[PDB]
Design a protein around this ligand. Structure first.
Ligand SMILES: [Cl-]
Ligand SMILES: [Cl-]
Ligand SMILES: [Cl-]
Ligand SMILES: [Cl-]
Ligand SMILES: [Mn+2]
Ligand SMILES: [Mn+2]
Ligand SMILES: [Mn+2]
Ligand SMILES: [Mn+2]
Ligand SMILES: [Mn+2]
Ligand SMILES: [Mn+2]
Ligand SMILES: [Mn+2]
Ligand SMILES: [Mn+2]
Lengths: 107, 85, 98, 93, 92, 105, 96, 78
DNA sequence: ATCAATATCCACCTGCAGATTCTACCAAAAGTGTATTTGGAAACTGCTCCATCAAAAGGCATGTTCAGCTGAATTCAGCTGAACATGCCTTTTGATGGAGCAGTTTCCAAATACACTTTTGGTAGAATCTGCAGGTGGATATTGAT
DNA sequence: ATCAATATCCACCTGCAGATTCTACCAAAAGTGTATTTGGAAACTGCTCCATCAAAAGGCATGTTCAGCTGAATTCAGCTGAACATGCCTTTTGATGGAGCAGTTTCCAAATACACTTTTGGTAGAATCTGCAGGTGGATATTGAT
């Protein structure tokens, strides 16, 4: 009886089984379907991939090997849809975007 | 051992610190009355958050405010904080 | 005549400096004393996780920076460059804080 | 004393998208916060969806609808594509 | 068979204003208000019990949720009324 | 027989509140006193808003409370206005309020 | 012939419409607009009457609140006339 | 064309109820713009609910859920 | 400012259509009685982590001087937006008729749940590996006097 | 238009605090078998909603006149930014000691489960009576001579 993981069967990195247990015990519904954990894990993995891509690119712009919170803030705020999705979120140690109102510049 | 009673600590939010905060917010010039005003709003904000955090602490029958209590208090007030869970 | 920058140059330079960095701008220990004093006014002999105070400080500074951005927009709207308490009041009223 | 997090999966995705990039402790904490937040948003909207329609089961359909409700447009289409592909590969394989 | 709070709202109205009525649309707004507050309190109590690894929502979770959700004086009155009702229920 | 709402000295339905707690996916279990507490709080808030709205209806020569009276009762009460600060009352209108600088001098 | 001064009738309209609660946009154009916008998201939709009514109540309440904030932004800059910049400032501060 | 059904007098009545005494001539078009955005954001979500219920009729409840999910809870239609 | 003329709004009133309240039937929800299980609190510890203070070095807060430039105050006209009269067309109101969608019941395959058993991926801690902070030095861009 | 003064930016470099990899145990996921729920399709029904037509009322589009508001221009006193000396208190790292959080066991009050009875809340039509057109008269506010 050979063991394969659901994350392998869905071609995913995120843990399908853990997401299933977390749905099954979070008092979300009486029952949970077989494909809901796969779908949710895939969506979470995709969003993680997008933010990691843009933050790593920001880290490479700064000649840095490790992503730090500042790179995540730069990736989030400079992307329209990411900034929309996290419009009420605070990134600790992220700072803000460089932005000076034109009327404040010397005349 | 016990600390001396804490008093009037809102004055620790010094004018230079408020100036740095406004600078990060893009402010170039600050009226002299802003600082006390800022302290006022800050205290209100802090009060509300701590009030909710301590409430969670009391519901768990704990005597230690945890980072999770603060995170839940911020989330319920619409100010989700990342990085402390 | 010793060197003297004109009013606004150092302010703009500080804007650039602090908009590029992410360190906390309020001193750690005074903020901790303020947090503990307020909590003491809610419930006595409370202890604090070290990360709880840091979370409170990150949240407070982010909130104040955003409020100062909105206050700057309110000051500029009325054709001036100096933020006044009236700007903070307008921004807070529009945000829903009032 | 055994705490679970998403850190290893996030790191595997990071090695996918940037083989030569690392990540700091605090940035990993931020990423874990992000994953948990999005999980809660999607699961709560799916719960409410199933309840609105008197269905006792959260299925792939509720998750898809919640993703369409929660994400901005193009990001929503991309996430729907990846979720659908994962479910179809899961069923047949 | 559609469910609403209409009869209970009308009974409370007759308590507070014996000779005052209510329009259909105002009653609909009443029902919306009741459902909204119910959902707020129940959701906060759910999250409270979950944060503390409790599978049971008790009067304690409801009390804490009411303290979190309502403004101060209103919260104190609502806590008083909840406690009073629970004590009369226990003794009844 | 006797109903739980009668035993709790309440008008609001204790049994219905318990069923709605058990069916809303809130927790695996629901305690005996939670529906009583919740029903009492809901009845109290309803009583407050109905009292103030009936006073508004009687100021308006009216026998029946209409949405306008509920809006007036909510917005003129500070804590009710806080609790419903992002709530829209259909057909409620707004509070009469003209900025002083717009009034003639 | 009688002629009120500019602003008097405006104030009278402010009082009258802040005193009443009826909907201020004509129903038929709003209904056509709702159906057109919905068509761009999904085709061959029908609409419950209460759905259109609720959409209009929401839209008018939103616009009235936005006009309050816009008026506050216009007054902030020491004038009595709301301009597009006032609406833009109000929406930017609200989060829109 | 159809967005022009929101006539100048209606936008003026809306501003009057909001307390506005004097209105710039460009405001009307600006208002139409924001109204369209608002309506779009609401209707999209409403339609999504309609699609999840395998219905072809937008119900008042769909609109109520769309409004609540956007932080603008509406009373009186449930 | 008073005084007359004019327009608007509010409070009243009657007649009655329409909305609300009252009434009675019944399917479904709550209540009841009894049996059984179980979550979590109470008690007991074992350590993690927090409170508080200590030293010392230097980073930063504070007060002061002074002057540049900003906010505040004011003036004035052009041209924008308000107010109003007029005529028409869009919306409103009313009626009629079907198609089409929203609900509803039932029944069987399919999907999901759950207990038991087996396997392994995830974790904590130890060991290993490394980028980047924190220094120095030089080039370069900016700023302000002159 | 330069030139001195100052700040910013770049490139280098190394040690260690922080990040990553390694390791092995075990909780949790997977496999299996059985029990329980449910989705949905097939046939059926009755409201809703949309299509369509028609009259007419009132609200809108348009043009005209002008009052007054907004924007520009100007001027000035004082406030706020720049720079500096001074000294304190924050930061960093660690010690000490105990508070309180977390792991574990035991067992009862409280919750769930189930079969059956009693009560109730929803619904539609009848009965009740309030709120609304559409009128008047009086109060109030506005506007123009003076
Ligand atoms: Cl001010
Ligand atoms: Cl599924
Ligand atoms: Cl309870
Ligand atoms: Cl403008
Ligand atoms: Mn105190
Ligand atoms: Mn147990
Ligand atoms: Mn100026
Ligand atoms: Mn292994
Ligand atoms: Mn460096
Ligand atoms: Mn102890
Ligand atoms: Mn009955
Ligand atoms: Mn009338």
């Amino acid at each position: 009886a050979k063991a394969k993981t659901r994350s392998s069967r869905a071609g995913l990195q995120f843990p399908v089984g853990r997401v299933h247990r977390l749905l099954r015990k979070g008092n979300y519904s009486e029952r949970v379907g077989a494909g809901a954990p796969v779908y949710l894990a895939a969506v979470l993995e995709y969003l993680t991939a997008e933010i990691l891509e843009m933050a790593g690119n920001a880290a490479r712009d700064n000649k840095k090997t490790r992503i730090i919170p500042r790179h995540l803030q730069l990736a989030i705020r400079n992307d329209e849809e990411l900034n929309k999705l996290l419009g009420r979120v605070t990134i600790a140690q992220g700072g803000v975007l460089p932005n000076i109102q034109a009327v404040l510049l010397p005349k | 051992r016990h600390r001396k009673v804490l008093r009037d600590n809102i004055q620790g939010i010094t004018k230079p610190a408020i100036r740095r905060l406004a600078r990060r917010g893009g402010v170039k010039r600050i009226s002299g009355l802003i600082y006390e005003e800022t302290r006022g709003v800050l205290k209100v904000f802090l009060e509300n958050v701590i009030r909710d955090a301590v409430t969670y602490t009391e519901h768990a029958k704990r005597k230690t405010v945890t980072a999770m209590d603060v995170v839940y208090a911020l989330k319920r007030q619409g100010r989700t904080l990342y990085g402390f869970g | 005549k010793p060197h003297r920058y004109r009013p606004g140059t150092v302010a703009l330079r500080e804007i650039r400096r602090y908009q590029k960095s992410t360190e906390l701008l309020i001193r750690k220990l005074p903020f901790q004393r303020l947090v503990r004093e307020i909590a003491q006014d809610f419930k006595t002999d409370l202890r604090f996780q070290s990360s709880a105070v840091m979370a409170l400080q990150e949240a407070c500074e982010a909130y104040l920076v955003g409020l100062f951005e909105d206050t700057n927009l309110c000051a500029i709207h009325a054709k001036r460059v100096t933020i006044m308490p009236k700007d903070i009041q307008l921004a807070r009223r529009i945000r829903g804080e009032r | 004393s055994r705490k679970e997090s998403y850190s290893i999966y996030v790191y595997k995705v990071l090695k996918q998208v940037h083989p030569d990039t690392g990540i700091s402790s605090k940035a990993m904490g931020i990423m874990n916060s992000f994953v948990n937040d999005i999980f809660e948003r999607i699961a709560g909207e799916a719960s409410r969806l199933a309840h609105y329609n008197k269905r006792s089961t959260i299925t792939s359909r509720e998750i898809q609808t919640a993703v369409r409700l929660l994400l901005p447009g193009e990001m929503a289409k991309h996430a729907v594509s990846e979720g659908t592909k994962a479910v179809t590969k899961y069923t047949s394989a």
